[PDB]
Amino acid sequence: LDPGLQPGQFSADEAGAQLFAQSYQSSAEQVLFQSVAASWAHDTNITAENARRQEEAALLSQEFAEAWGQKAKELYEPIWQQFTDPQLRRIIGAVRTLGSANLPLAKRQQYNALLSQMSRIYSTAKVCLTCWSLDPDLTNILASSRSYAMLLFAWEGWHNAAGIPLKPLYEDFTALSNEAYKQDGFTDTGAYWRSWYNSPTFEDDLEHLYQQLEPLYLNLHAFVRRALHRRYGDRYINLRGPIPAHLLGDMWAQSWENIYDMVVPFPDKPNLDVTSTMLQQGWQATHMFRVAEEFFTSLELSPMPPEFWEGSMLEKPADGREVVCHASAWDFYNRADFRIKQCTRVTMDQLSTVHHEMGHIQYYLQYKDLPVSLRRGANPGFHEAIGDVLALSVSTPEHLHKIGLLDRVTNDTESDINYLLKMALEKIAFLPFGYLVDQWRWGVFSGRTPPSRYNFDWWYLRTKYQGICPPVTRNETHFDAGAKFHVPNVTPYIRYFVSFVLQFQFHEALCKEAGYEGPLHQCDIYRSTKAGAKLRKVLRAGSSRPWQEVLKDMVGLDALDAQPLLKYFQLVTQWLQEQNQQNGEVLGWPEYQWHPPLPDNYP
């Protein structure tokens, strides 16, 4: 470790720890910057040489974290917890957690290389026979093909191509990750991930939320299953069984927006999916990002700085070059550089993804002046909810009218149901998936799910929560979890479930602050400077305060609460129940063993 980056001497008391944290912050920004910069260079240009550089940078980060971590322990182990300064305890608590820097050097290299190889396999995997990429080719097929055989070819092809080679690497990664975090005092990596919520009853609290939400999902599922049955027939759709996992518009069946045209209750009302209008009008990536920015500035939040426009990658590069297409928002930790990397396509769901990613950036802009350790959301679910809350206003027919994407205006019960059903396809359908992913991973980290049961336990959870089944046979050579970006990229997932509840709590509070006084689902906070000020206080706080207190100031309650979500969806919840009863549906999938046959000439 370069001399200028190494820790000096500090007295063993709160006054020294303040000087320590300031010296740390000088050197940390340089170290974070080089790490993020090397990751950027790799992820926008996947080559062997860029992976090598990234590995070296990660290694430097570890040397940094070890030196400053072990000094923090040496001086403040017995006493950091009793510091008067809450911000300082949070800083010292972060610096003392070494993570992968607890591993000896040879295992650090192995860990760094596994992350790099797993990333590569996911982002370069192809389906052949002339080769399709995930983004855009398979994405587009899952979205818009209504051919059972074509969808199956894409689904199976992707799961096989990405999952199978990841399996041996993921096993080695899990063992190293656990060994690392066990030296920080955690029973397993999952226990560390959960510690971010700073709640002793986190798992129970989440289970209690899911219990309230489950009926909404069961009714949506049943209604959609019926529509699919009318399309695909009795051979491929079982009205008492799980839905084949490739038919819901998305590779992971995680949001069902893309099958909106098959399930729309009242097709004579305005067409609420404005993708065809965006194409018809010649929208490009750059317009999408400008439109999102202007929402932010309408609230008197910050514009994207020059550095964002100059540095970002907003389209898939046309020179063939390999990139990580999965959308992400980047803080370089120098208070100047912030970027989005997205292989943007011109669709309505991409418009929401653009807002999601710009949400992250906005967080980074508002807390950039905090100590590095505090540059994060109050919890990870907060960071995930910011852009989604704005996108709730954007997708309102009223708002779409104002930005020229929906010519016809209507305010009637049928139009309301169409809108709420579309939003349910996006939000309610996702809930089981958001909850299940880390239940899977927590099991793997704890050792409840050994390699020999990775796929069996994955599909157990997929069926249990989503009520889907694999459309071809799977065995433990398959590693279907590995075909979802966040697993090889080691990104936690429970944040999204938290986000999907929290965003409706935020929505409710911001609407009320805006002075709006109609139905919650018709609220648009566009141009509300007051809503903007309330959101700004959250973003500026970073992780400097407990998330429960931040939530209380914002929404008036110190806990996650499903009631705002329930209220938002109330009309369609009631409608869907009524539709399902009158059609005599079975709620759930009691033929839990059922799988569809292979199509006649498959492949």
Ligand X SMILES: *[C@@H]1O[C@H](CO[C@@H]2O[C@@H](C)[C@@H](O)[C@@H](O)[C@@H]2O)[C@@H](O[C@@H]2O[C@H](CO)[C@@H](O)[C@H](O)[C@H]2NC(C)=O)[C@H](O)[C@H]1NC(C)=O
Ligand Y SMILES: CCC[C@H](N[C@@H](C)C(=O)N1[C@H](C(=O)O)C[C@@H]2CCCC[C@@H]21)C(=O)O
- Residues in binding site for Zn(2+): 356, 360, 384
CB of 121 to ligand Y, least distance (A): 16
Phi, psi of 564 (to 5 degrees): -55, -45
CB of 535 to Zn ion, least distance (A): 16
CA dist., res. 422 & res. 401, Å (int)? 17
CA dist., res. 503 & res. 365, Å (int)? 20
User: What does each C-alpha distance from 420 to 385, 518, 520 come to in angstroms?
Assistant: 19, 15, 11
Q: Of these, 473, 517, 600, 601, which contacts ligand NAG (CB under 6 A)?
A: 473
Q: Of these, 411, 413, 563, 593, which contacts ligand X (CB under 6 A)?
A: 411
Q: Which amino acid is at 233?
A: G
Catalytic hit among 357, 426, 508, 585: 357
State the DSSP string of 231-292: HH-TTT--TTSPEETTSSSSTTS---GGGHHHH-S-TTS-----HHHHHHHT--HHHHHHHH
Binding to ligand Y by residue 496, rule CB under 6 A?
yes
Cβ proximity to Cl ion: between 19 and 559 the closer is: 559
Half-sphere exposure of 103 (CA within 13 A, CB side): 22
User: What are the residue ranges of helices labelled H in 395-493?
Assistant: 397-402, 413-427, 430-446, 454-461
Of 30-38, 303-311, 354-362, 399-407, which segment contacts ligand Y by CB under 6 A? Answer: 354-362
Cβ proximity to ligand Y: between 188 and 388 the closer is: 388
Q: Of these, 477, 563, 574, 581, which contacts ligand NAG (CB under 6 A)?
A: 477
Tokens of 128: 């052949």
CB of 356 to ligand X, least distance (A): 24
3-state secondary structure at position 433: helix
**Cβ 557 vs Cβ 551: under 8 Å:** yes
Cβ proximity to Zn ion: between 384 and 561 the closer is: 384
Q: Of these, 152, 329, 417, 444, which contacts ligand Y (CB under 6 A)?
A: 329
Q: Of these, 16, 136, 265, 519, which contacts ligand X (CB under 6 A)?
A: 519
User: What are the residue ranges of helices labelled H in 44-147?
Assistant: 48-76, 86-96, 105-124, 139-144
List, as residue ranges, the binding site: 197, 356, 360, 384, 495
CB of 439 to Cl ion, least distance (A): 13
Q: How many beta carbons lie within 10 A of that of residue 505, not counting itself?
A: 23
Binding to ligand NAG by residue 286, rule CB under 6 A?
no
Cβ proximity to ligand Y: between 326 and 536 the closer is: 326
Q: Return residues touching Cl ion (CB under 5 A).
A: 380, 492, 494-495
CB of 411 to ligand X, least distance (A): 4
Residues 92-121 that bind ligand NAG (CB under 6 A): none
When CB distances are held under 5 to 8 angstroms depending on the partner's kind, the choice from ligand Y, Zn ion, Cl ion, none that residue 427 binds is: none
136, containing H or E segment: none
Binding to ligand X by residue 515, rule CB under 6 A?
no
Cβ proximity to ligand X: between 571 and 587 the closer is: 571
Beta strands 243-244; 131-132: pairing state: unpaired
Q: Catalytic annotation on 355?
A: no
The closest alpha carbon to 32, from 381, 335, 382, belongs to 335
CB of 356 to ligand Y, least distance (A): 5
Catalytic hit among 398, 486, 513, 591: 486
Cβ proximity to ligand NAG: between 105 and 598 the closer is: 598
Of 155-163, 320-328, 409-417, 537-545, which segment contacts ligand Y by CB under 6 A? Answer: 320-328
Which letter, b or e, does each residue of 509-537 get, where b requires 16 or more Cβ atoms within 10 Å of its Cβ?
bbbbbbebeeebbbbbbbebeebbebbbe
The closest alpha carbon to 221, from 187, 244, 201, belongs to 244
CB of 425 to ligand X, least distance (A): 21
Cβ proximity to ligand NAG: between 477 and 574 the closer is: 477
Angle at which helices 529-541 and 380-394 cross, to 10°: 160
Cβ proximity to Zn ion: between 391 and 511 the closer is: 391
Of 85-93, 131-139, 380-388, 563-571, which segment contacts Zn ion by CB under 5 A? Answer: 380-388
Q: Catalytic annotation on 246?
A: no
The distance from CA 499 to its chain's CA centroid, rounded to whole angstroms, is 9
Of 32-40, 235-243, 251-259, 512-520, which segment contacts ligand X by CB under 6 A? Answer: 512-520
CB of 475 to ligand NAG, least distance (A): 4
Binding to ligand X by residue 398, rule CB under 6 A?
yes
**Cβ 328 vs Cβ 357: under 8 Å:** yes
**Cβ 544 vs Cβ 310: under 8 Å:** no
Binding to ligand X by residue 179, rule CB under 6 A?
no
With vertex at residue 423, the alpha carbon angle to CA 429 and CA 596, rounded to the nearest 5 degrees, is 35
The closest alpha carbon to 57, from 70, 71, 69, 43, belongs to 43
Contacts with ligand Y: how many residues (CB under 6 A)? 13
By the criterion CB under 6 A, which residues form the site for ligand X?
A: 398, 411, 517-519, 522
Positions in the binding site for ligand NAG (CB under 6 A)? 45, 47, 49-50, 473, 475, 477
Q: Annotated active-site positions, please? A: 357, 486
* Residues of this chain that bind ligand Y (CB under 6 A): 254, 326-329, 353, 356-357, 360, 384, 388, 491, 496
